[PDB]
Design a protein around this ligand. Structure first.
Ligand code: GNP
Ligand code: GNP
Ligand code: GTP
Ligand code: MG
Ligand code: MG
Ligand code: MG
Lengths: 201, 62, 441, 454, 393, 104
RNA sequence: CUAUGCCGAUCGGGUGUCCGCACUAAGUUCGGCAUCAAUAUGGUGACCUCCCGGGAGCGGGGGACCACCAGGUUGCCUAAGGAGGGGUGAACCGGCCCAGGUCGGAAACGGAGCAGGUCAAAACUCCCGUGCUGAUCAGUAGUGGGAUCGCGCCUGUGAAUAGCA
């Protein structure tokens, strides 16, 4: 159906969106509205999927997320590895929100966490990011205690350390970075992304 | 917590019994009140804290 | 012997009185109120009741280092009113004319202040700032009046003065000046664009030669002024060392100077006895620990910022504290040298125990001396020297503890002395001979 | 013109020529932040600290045109430029921009440098000669001596909507700014035949209301408490506001909520001017201790009151409370301050000095749901007082808004919008009663629905 | 024509609408005022040429003066009978501080005043009243044990009636229409104490929301004059007028400060001046009595001559004349030549004799009359002598 | 069809706006109609004077300011009665010059 | 000599509460006095000089210099001086409109001009703004000392604190 790109502000979602389409570097700014484009899989079949990019600004994430959750078949989440340390709480909260939204769907979409800005040296490894996310989400569930002033969902059985294995979702991790220098001129690093898209196709 | 304090130590030890109970209080709280203007009730009403709590001679019935 | 920081004063006045968000009316009101307060405090009444007699400050008056601030605030108020008129001139063009008049006043005030800085009484650093401020005001006035040549010359002069001043100070102090240069960077460009970009190159080429020939004498004399100002500032009021090269504006630096002079007044005073300086040593220790606490008072918020994020690096947070800690450790070392002098003057059982306790104290002190720069790890020779002193003191403590007179341990003291002899040789005359004689006996 | 850029609403740069003269690191990101939150009412003018900026919107093809010029004042040609080239660009690339899909934009190329350079040099040549001031001044002297949506068609409903927002306790200037933003959002945009103009403008206005009332990230105090406990340093929260906004009641509610969550609290008092405030807080502490015995939590005390009597300076009491909490290892300190009028300068200076000295982790402005047309002024005064009294760049401003007495109107919620307009900070808590259990959060959808249900 | 006048009026009305809305005034009242002022202007059919905006400002000032007060005289205390005043309002309105200020004000007026509190739900309420009473040195009543406001108020009012206090003030906690229990508690308190007046206090900053609360207060229980508070701040309190419309009662006092001494009686002129923002307002059988007093002026002579010429020939009454008519008409012209200041003056002869320039001006304005002026003065003096002789008898 | 002359034309103290027609230096002080009539009669006998009518701008009621002069300069056939004085200016200046001699 | 305390157990240094304090910074409030000029064009009003025409009232036209209002570009002005708003216009002499009356005339009509009305443009005066001035206060706060037998904070380390006969 459609594949959604989600992340924080200045997370690089538009850059990956244009890279997966044209393969050329294009200057970009912060997203204001969504952008939907049909992209064919590189395989011999060449099936077409609608890649939809949603702005990462916190004033518009929830509206588009709740408006486009039904049409989505697969969900792609983007995390900035270079700036992860300063924004661990923000990415954890957004991941919790998107997981809660996804669990409401009748059909469970495939879930991918793609670290970005990996071309830089300070970027962290995939397993380290996964462990940090697990540790933060262990307490983030407990922190959810407030009156909505108007249906809660739990990511674990209240007794054990939160893990992605116990979740009824297929969560994948990979390393990708396409900005320049090593990334675009030298050799593109998005082949794992297209392989995963073919696998989920 | 015990601390030694400097000052008129011979004159502090001359009584050797007890100092004045209100040793650190403002002049208007002192028993003598050091009052150039003893009353100054309207002046205290005009400026200062909104309400002062102390011994009340007004009616206090429960 | 009196100086004033014009740029710092005007910036701290602007950033806290409405110019932070771009408001000039309340800033002008504050400037007028401060002028009134200064005139009231200094009793510089020029107009009494039913009369008015404007009077100018003379050279003999400015000894209080505050009369210059009066003219500075007058110039700032005129400039603020001019900027407010510029903002309001969009609605009514007539205000522009009024604007010009205000500028005609403002530069005059600045130039008056310049003629008040010609006296040798005021410091040269204030003279440079006054010249830069006057040049900036004149350039802005000429730019407003569509006079490109005078404005560009004044702006170039101001930029040169500011960059020379920034190079004269440290990197931490100069950034503000650099910011000011940035604030003057765009307008200058626009002036060149007003030339036409065709004759502008030739004008700049001629202006370089004009500055080299006409202002060349002024350039070299101001360079000499900067050099002598830096030299006298480092020699008299400021302190420059390997650690904490940034000039500490805090008053406690003077205390260090006192400590410093005490040092050169102590060693000559006490030759061998050193007994009469023990009270002086205690007073110096009290003063230096008070200075350390005062430094820590401002250190702690920076420690909080350092703990907040890993982005912040070292070299600024612990640049002044480490010098004071080093001074305290040096004073402790001198005290321990005095204790060693007393011990060697002598030659009963609790005395070696107390000596070993003191040696443990100095071991802890040298451990801290290694740790603090070791925590910073700016340089590397300091840790080497500190560790050498630490191992030497540890070997001395071991030799004192294992002395056969000190310790009555047969068949055990000899083994320890033999084991420590190799360490002492690795670290490395009378002390060695005495230790060898004690080991033999 | 030292900077210029044309890009679509999708965040994809189409054409720019800034070069080495300027870098688009974040001069346009700031403009995007302004146009999204705290919409610009400066009539297409923005004042970035480095240089001024001007923007133009085209909702027909969701495009924007930004021109950045230095802080030095330019001539009046620039706006004319931003018009003509716009049409020219709209004339040059009709086929590419008219397509909904963004693939055509990537496929297409734009050799727009030559035409834009020609327009710029023509405008500069026109600006070189301007000597019409004398004739205009003489004329003034004589006078003194003597489908696509059009703005005019949508004016009427606009004003009526404005009136409705006025009925809903929204500030007049806030309503005008919101109407201007909505009008800018709808200029020549195509409109479907099935929908009506009123329905479209109402939907756009409610979407804008949801966006503005959905502020920046919802960072919570509870998560930050553990982060503060990582270094074993107290977490400081300060309450500020004008008189009669229920600071003490909301303070008690927050303390009760924290105790229920299982964290020890320290209540520092500074309402020295207020008569009986110390005993009021003492009664609150007694009630909380009765509800939560010390032994049930492990034998350690939970809530303690810190005060020095009436008349003492607030900053010293706050500093002593912070030191005592650090020595006793209290999780969180909550500081209550006496209400201060915004026009009273000395009280604002004292509050700013207290905030600067105590550097609290969180600052909460307690506002009123009943107040109208005055919340904006109070927020402006508080923010400017906190800003000008701190010399450091990017000073600590108000970080949280607590709206109380929400259960007394239930229809005039629009006042909250005004606050959320004047400051971009989110609303942390909403009070809905006088008991200790009336401390709930804010639901944006419900608030908007109640605002526009009539 | 008044073609551009209509556009100018519309622009000024829009500006006034913006200014009033910035002054936290209800939109419905603004629209009603706009309709009334536009109707009044159309009735006038002309605009004052003295100033373009002064006339409009004066008209809206008069309209607001009419709207602010219902016309009912404010209630005043009566000596010899104890007066009970019950304070009501919303939460945070500052009703307790208003009670303290009013008690101090009445004590300064020479009254035996006392304070009683019924606020029991709010924690730490009676302590504030105690501190405020001992600050002003005024007797107070209350207890920390009993929680029912009704019994506490009844006991306090009975004890103070025994004490023979002139003025009793009773304060109760603020409440809103949503909670009906608080309203029924207020009703029970009113039944128990039977208050003489019920004063409702509302914050000046609160606007466009307090109208419903005021209407509910008026509907459930009787109300009296209202008091506005917190006027010392930037808020102009423009919404309080709506509360007046909900109560049809005037304002007796205003609150312009935190200290107890800041308490002043309400005045309409400063309030409307603050609301407008400029406050630029400029304000500007007898014959038998005069005959008895004997005072005669040139006005009386002119009226007598007018009546004589209206009557016509004297031969008609009795039953050469043309010269008499000519003399009469020339005298009327010469007496109309001069100004009214000399005409209404009691002693015209003195003011003429002191300044011959007045005679010169009169001669300029009429015929030569080089001898007629003094003849007229002599005739006026003779008539004044006759008038005083008649008045004496 | 005689031309009209008034004493107010020959008065120096009167302003030009109030009736003065000649420079102040050449004028005289308080001229009368009879003086003008007798001085102009020495040249032409066509002048006749009346005293019961006065000039319009003469607000003051005085005998010396009362009266007017009629002088014939044209024979009503297209020829000047006296070629010496072709304009009223000549006649009035001659009268102004001759007044002081008779006043002394 | 018995016994005392517990990890800092002995011994100490700054501070803050404190002062009929000194002084500053930053604010509130209330008074006094003061508030420019050239030049470009146009307008208004005096006063003055030239003409043209007519039997008068008067009509036609061009200058002189002063004051003042709009208001072009400005400065060898400024302590500061905005083209800001308002009142009064008197006794009876600042305009403008000027009934009646009065005067010029056969008439048409005009002129002076009172009362009265009116005012971008006599003069005076007030308000705001601006400058200078005195006065005013603490629910603003900071070292400069004093004070300091406790009560609240920050920094120190020895083993040695107080009875016995
Ligand atoms: N209905 C309602 N009443 C509330 C709410 N919050 C507070 N109140 C009421 O409003 C009043 C204000 O009480 P208080 O907390 O003492 O006010 P304050 O802001 O602390 N005053 P100050 O700042 O001067 O100390 C009390 O009567 C309280 O019960 C709320 O959310 N809803
Ligand atoms: N500026 C100003 N503040 C006032 C005035 N009256 C009261 N306040 C303040 O407003 C707040 C509320 O007043 P207060 O009487 O203490 O609360 P309350 O009236 O008892 N609340 P309730 O009776 O509803 O429980 C307090 O902080 C008080 O100091 C006033 O006239 N002016
Ligand atoms: N070094 C590096 N930078 C990246 C990478 N991906 C994105 N960026 C950053 O992203 C910026 C460009 O903006 P985008 O990549 O489109 O980010 P965005 O899509 O606008 O993110 P939103 O604001 O949420 O819309 C560049 O300036 C980069 O700094 C990457 O892989 N490596
Ligand atoms: Mg994007
Ligand atoms: Mg409170
Ligand atoms: Mg109350």
């Amino acid at each position: 159906r459609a594949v959604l790109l989600l992340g924080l502000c200045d997370s690089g979602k538009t850059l990956l969106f244009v890279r997966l389409l044209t393969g050329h570097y294009r200057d970009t700014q912060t997203s204001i509205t969504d952008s939907s484009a049909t992209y064919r899989v590189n395989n011999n079949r060449g099936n077409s999927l609608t890649l939809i990019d949603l702005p990462g600004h916190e004033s518009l994430r929830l509206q588009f997320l709740e408006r486009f959750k039904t049409s989505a078949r697969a969900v792609v989440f983007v995390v900035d590895s270079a700036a992860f340390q300063r924004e661990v709480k923000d990415v954890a909260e957004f991941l919790y929100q998107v997981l809660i939204d996804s669990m409401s769907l009748k059909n469970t979409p495939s879930f991918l966490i793609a670290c970005n800005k990996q071309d830089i040296a300070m970027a962290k490894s995939a397993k380290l990011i996964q462990q940090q996310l697990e540790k933060e989400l262990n307490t983030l569930r407990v922190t959810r205690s407030a009156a909505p002033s108007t249906a809660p969902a739990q990511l674990g059985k209240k007794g054990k350390e939160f893990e992605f294995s116990q979740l009824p979702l297929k969560v994948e991790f990979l390393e990708c970075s396409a900005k320049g220098g090593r990334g675009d001129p030298g050799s593109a690093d998005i082949q794992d992304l297209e392989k995963w898209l073919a696998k989920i196709a | 917590k015990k601390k030694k304090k400097k000052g008129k130590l011979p004159k502090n030890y001359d009584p050797k019994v007890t100092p004045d109970p209100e040793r650190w209080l403002p002049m208007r709280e002192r028993s003598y009140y050091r009052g150039r203007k003893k009353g100054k009730k309207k002046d205290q009403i005009g400026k200062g804290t909104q309400g002062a709590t102390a011994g009340a001679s007004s009616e206090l019935d429960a | 012997s009196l100086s004033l920081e014009i740029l710092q004063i005007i910036k701290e006045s602007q950033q806290q009185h409405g110019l932070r968000h771009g408001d000039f009316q309340r800033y002008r009101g504050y400037c007028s109120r401060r002028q009134r307060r200064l005139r009231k405090t200094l009793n510089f009444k020029m107009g009494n009741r039913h009369k008015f007699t404007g009077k100018k400050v003379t050279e003999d008056l400015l000894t209080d280092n505050r009369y210059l601030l009066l003219v500075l605030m007058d110039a700032e108020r005129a400039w603020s009113y001019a900027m407010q008129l510029k903002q309001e001139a969009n609605t009514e063009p007539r205000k522009r004319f009024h604007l010009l008049s205000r500028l005609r006043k403002a530069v005059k005030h600045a130039e008056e202040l310049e003629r008040l800085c010609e006296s040798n009484r005021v410091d040269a650093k204030t003279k440079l700032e006054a010249q830069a401020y006057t040049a900036y005001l004149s350039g802005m006035l000429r730019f407003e009046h569509q006079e490109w040549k005078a404005a560009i010359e004044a702006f170039n002069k101001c930029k040169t003065i500011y960059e020379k001043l920034a190079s004269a100070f440290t990197e931490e102090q100069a950034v503000l000046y650099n910011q000011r240069v940035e604030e003057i960077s765009p307008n200058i460009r626009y002036c060149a664009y007003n030339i036409g970009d065709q004759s502008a190159i030739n004008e700049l080429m001629q202006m370089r030669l004009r500055s080299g020939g006409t202002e060349g004498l002024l350039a070299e004399k101001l360079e000499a002024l900067i050099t002598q100002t830096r030299a006298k500032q480092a020699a008299t009021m400021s302190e420059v060392e390997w650690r904490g090269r940034t000039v500490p504006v805090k008053i406690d630096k003077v205390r260090i100077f006192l400590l410093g002079l005490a040092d050169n007044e102590a060693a000559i005073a006490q030759a061998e006895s050193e007994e009469t300086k023990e009270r002086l040593f205690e007073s110096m220790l009290s003063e230096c620990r008070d200075a350390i606490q005062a430094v820590r008072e401002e250190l702690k918020p920076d420690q909080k910022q350092r703990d907040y994020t890993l982005d912040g690096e070292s070299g600024k947070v612990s640049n002044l504290q480490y010098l004071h800690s080093y001074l305290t450790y040096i004073k402790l070392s001198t005290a321990i040298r005095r204790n060693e002098n007393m011990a060697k003057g002598l030659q009963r059982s609790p005395r070696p125990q107390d000596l070993i306790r003191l040696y443990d104290i100095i071991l802890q002190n040298l451990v801290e001396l290694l740790q603090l720069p070791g925590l910073e790890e700016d340089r590397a020779f300091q840790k080497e020297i500190g560790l050498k002193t630490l191992v030497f003191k540890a070997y001395r403590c071991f030799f004192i503890a294992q002395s056969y007179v000190l310790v009555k341990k047969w068949s055990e003291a000899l083994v320890l002395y033999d084991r420590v002899l190799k360490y002492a040789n690795e670290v490395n005359x009378x002390x060695x001979x005495x230790x060898x004689x004690x080991x033999x006996x | 013109l030292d900077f210029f850029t044309i890009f679509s609403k999708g965040g994809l740069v189409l054409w720019c020529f800034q070069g080495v003269s300027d870098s688009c690191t974040g001069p346009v990101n700031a403009l995007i932040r302004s146009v999204l939150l705290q919409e610009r009412g400066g009539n297409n003018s923005f004042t970035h600290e480095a240089l001024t900026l001007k923007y133009k919107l085209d909702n027909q093809f969701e495009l924007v045109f930004v021109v950045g010029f230095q802080k030095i004042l330019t001539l009046t040609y620039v706006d004319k430029l931003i018009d003509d080239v716009h049409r020219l660009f709209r004339d040059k690339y009709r086929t590419e921009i008219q397509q909904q899909s963004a693939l055509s934009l990537l496929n297409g190329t734009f050799d727009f440098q030559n035409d834009f350079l020609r327009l710029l040099r023509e405008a500069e040549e026109s600006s070189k000669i301007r000597a019409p001031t004398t004739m205009k001044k003489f004329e003034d002297s004589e006078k003194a001596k003597k489908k696509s949506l059009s703005r005019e068609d949508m004016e009427s409903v606009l004003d009526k909507m404005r009136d409705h927002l006025i009925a809903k306790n929204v500030a007049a200037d806030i309503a005008v700014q919101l109407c201007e933003s909505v009008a800018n959002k709808l200029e020549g945009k195509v409109m479907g035949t099935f929908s009506t103009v009123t329905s479209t403008v109402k939907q756009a206005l409610q979407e804008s209301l949801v966006q503005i009332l959905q502020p920046q990230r919802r960072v919570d105090m509870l998560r930050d408490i553990m982060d503060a406990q990582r270094r074993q340093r107290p977490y400081v929260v300060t309450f500020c506001g004008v008189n009669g906004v229920g600071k003490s009641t909301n303070l008690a509610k927050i303390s009760f909520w924290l105790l229920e969550n299982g964290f020890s609290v320290l209540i520092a008092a500074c309402d020295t001017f207020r008569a009986g405030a110390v005993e009021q807080l003492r009664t609150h502490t007694r009630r909380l201790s009765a509800l939560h015995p010390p032994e049930k939590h492990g034998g350690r005390t939970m809530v303690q009151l810190f005060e020095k009597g009436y008349g003492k300076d607030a900053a010293g009491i706050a500093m002593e409370a912070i030191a005592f909490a650090r020595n006793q290892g209290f999780d969180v300190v909550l500081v209550d301050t006496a209400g201060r009028m915004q026009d009273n300068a000395p009280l604002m200076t004292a509050l700013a000095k207290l905030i600067t000295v105590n550097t609290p982790d969180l600052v909460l402005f307690v506002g009123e749901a009943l107040v109208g047309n005055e919340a904006v002024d109070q927020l402006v005064k508080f923010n400017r007082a906190l800003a000008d009294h701190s010399m450091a760049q990017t000073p600590r401003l108000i970080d949280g808004i607590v709206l109380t007495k929400f259960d007394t109107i239930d229809d005039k919620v629009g006042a909250a919008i005004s606050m959320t307009y004047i400051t971009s900070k989110p609303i942390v808590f909403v009070g809905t009663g006088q008991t200790y259990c009336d401390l709930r959060s804010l639901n944006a959808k419900a608030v908007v629905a109640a605002l526009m249900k009539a | 024509a008044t073609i551009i006048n209509e556009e100018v009026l519309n622009a000024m009305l829009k500006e006034v609408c913006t200014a009033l809305l910035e002054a936290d005034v209800n939109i419905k009242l603004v629209k009603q005022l706009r309709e009334n002022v536009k109707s009044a202007i159309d009735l006038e059919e002309m605009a004052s040429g003295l100033n373009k905006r002064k006339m409009i400002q004066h008209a809206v000032f008069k309209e607001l003066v009419k709207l602010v007060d219902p016309g009912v005289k404010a209630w005043t205390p009566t000596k010899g009978k104890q007066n009970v005043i019950m304070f009501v309002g919303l939460q945070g309105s500052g009703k307790t501080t208003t009670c303290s200020k009013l008690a101090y004000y009445y004590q300064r007026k020479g009254w035996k005043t006392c304070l009683i509190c019924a606020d029991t739900f709010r924690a730490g309420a009676f302590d504030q009243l105690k501190q405020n009473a001992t600050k002003a040195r005024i007797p107070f009543y209350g207890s920390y044990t009993e929680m029912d406001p009704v019994i506490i108020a009844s006991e306090g009012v009975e004890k103070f009636k025994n004490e023979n206090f002139e003025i009793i003030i009773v304060d109760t906690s603020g409440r809103h229409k949503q909670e009906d229990s608080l309203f029924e508690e207020m009703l029970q308190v009113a039944n128990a104490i039977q208050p003489d007046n019920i004063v409702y206090v509302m914050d000046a900053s609160i606007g466009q929301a307090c109208e419903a609360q005021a209407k509910a207060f008026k509907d459930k229980v009787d109300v009296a004059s209202v008091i506005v508070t917190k006027l010392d701040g930037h808020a102009k309190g423009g919404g309080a007028l709506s509360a007046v419309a909900a109560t049809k009662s005037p304002i007796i006092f205003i609150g312009t400060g935190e200290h107890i001494d800041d308490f002043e009686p309400f005045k309409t002129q400063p309030f409307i001046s603050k609301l407008l923002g400029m406050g630029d307002i400029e304000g500007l059988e007898a014959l038998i009595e005069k005959l008895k007093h004997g005072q005669f002026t040139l006005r009386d002579m002119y009226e007598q001559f007018q009546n004589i010429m209206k009557m016509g020939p004297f031969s008609q009454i009795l039953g050469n004349e043309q010269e008499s008519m000519a003399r009469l008409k020339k005298l009327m012209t010469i007496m109309d030549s001069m100004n009214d200041q000399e005409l209404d003056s009691t002693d015209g002869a003195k003011v003429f004799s002191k300044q011959p320039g007045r005679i010169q001006r009169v001669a300029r304005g009429s015929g030569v009359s080089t001898r007629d002026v003094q003849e007229l003065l002599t005739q006026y003096t003779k008539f004044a002598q006759m008038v005083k002789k008649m008045g004496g008898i | 069809r005689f031309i009209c002359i008034y004493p107010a034309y020959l008065n120096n103290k009167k302003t030009i706006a109030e009736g003065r027609r000649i420079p102040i230096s050449k004028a005289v002080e308080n001229p009368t109609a009879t003086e003008i009539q007798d001085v102009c009669s020495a040249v032409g006998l066509n002048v006749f004077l009346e005293k019961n009518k006065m000039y319009s701008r003469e607000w003051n009621r005085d005998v010396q300011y009362r009266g007017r002069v009629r002088v014939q300069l044209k024979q009503e056939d297209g020829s000047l009665c006296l070629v010496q004085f072709p304009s009223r200016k000549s006649v009035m200046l001659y009268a102004a010059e001759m007044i002081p001699k008779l006043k002394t």
